[PDB]
Nucleic acid binder design. Structure first.
Ligand SMILES: [Mg+2]
Ligand SMILES: [Mg+2]
Ligand SMILES: [Mg+2]
Ligand SMILES: [Mg+2]
Lengths: 212, 211
DNA sequence: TAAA
């Protein structure tokens, strides 16, 4: 019963959703979005954060989108692969947005916040695509994010995803980079570990005096 | 400074706190009006604290847009004679110079912008640096340390005024939106978050966490 | 929903 967990209390009513995108370049406005995965989070009985629902979509390049060969070489994606099962930006985001809104309502939150590694990257691609497909009721905060690079820099003294995960004691496999799914799952587990560690060490909840 | 732990704390990144004031939300089209920068240092006990402060009022670039709602919000009159405004180039060149000195003196490799909802300030600083064709920009081209996310983790608060108050800091509504004051509160906030994690034993890491 |  999500309403009954502390999820909504932990981040002032923000519902954290982990996102990774794969793309055909670095420019959210002109380069194709090719893949997206999303993982909602939940808080267990002891107040530990953990992954909840996972969504994963392969995305058809938008009308007029550019595709940089270096990007494709990097993520190893072939936009014309039959087994891609590519759907439109609209269907992918619409399905993600539906599940996220459901989680928001079920948990007693008020909106979603994107958790991502160098989060401005994914946030911009996700916003540009939502703009393209004219999605409304976008549950994500229009500008605020939870960047795991910054968070790992604080908690672990590491900003690089693979290194942060290793330092946190997670396995990280260079072969499995870069499915959107694998990177999203490692980023979710990393983020949960950072928040849980903070609770472990007594940093949260705050003391009485810290009530203002 | 190379004998402090500053360069070891963030894998060679030299943290610089930044706040800009602007005539709108679009880094590409709206004027950059003001910017402050605060470098950090570690004391002998390993605590982070503000080091050098810089503060510039900025002349709107050629063709820049000025949204009235932004002016109303930040209280800035671009034509106030007392502004002592300088060009984007002069401001960023001076900021960049002092940051490059700090990097070399502390033994770091790159600077990383600390800012509140940092993509905002990072975008304007980068846009301006591009327009003025500044060279050897010491800031990481895409990585930031967002104090909104950091405060969300450390304090359960993402709004700057609230984060600060929660952390036991003063925060004054009247002083808000001078770049100087916002930068100073943001620096003190960021240092408190880092210092708190150290106080609680979160840093340094244990032996097992060494890879 | 607070980076102007
Ligand atoms: Mg990524
Ligand atoms: Mg990836
Ligand atoms: Mg600001
Ligand atoms: Mg301000």
């Amino acid at each position: 019963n999500a309403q009954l967990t502390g999820l909504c209390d932990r981040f002032r009513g923000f519902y954290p959703v982990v996102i990774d995108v794969e793309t055909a370049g670095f420019n959210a406005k002109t380069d194709a979005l090719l893949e997206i995965a999303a993982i909602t989070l939940k808080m267990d009985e002891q107040g530990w954060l953990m992954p909840d629902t996972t969504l994963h979509f392969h995305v058809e390049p938008f009308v007029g989108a550019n595709l940089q060969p270096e990007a494709l070489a990097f993520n190893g994606i072939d936009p014309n692969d039959p087994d891609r099962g590519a759907v439109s930006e609209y269907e992918a985001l619409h399905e993600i947005f539906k599940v996220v809104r459901k989680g928001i309502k079920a948990s007693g939150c008020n909106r979603a916040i994107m958790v991502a590694h160098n989060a401005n990257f994914d946030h911009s691609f996700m916003m540009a695509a939502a703009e393209r497909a004219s999605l409304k009721r976008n549950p994500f905060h229009p500008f605020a994010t939870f960047d795991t690079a910054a968070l790992a820099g604080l908690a672990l003294g590491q900003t690089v995803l693979s290194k942060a995960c290793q330092t946190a004691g997670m396995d990280f496999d260079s072969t499995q980079a870069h499915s959107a799914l694998y990177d999203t799952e490692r980023t979710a587990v990393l983020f949960c570990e950072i928040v849980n560690r903070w609770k472990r060490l007594g940093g949260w909840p705050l003391s009485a005096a810290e009530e203002v």
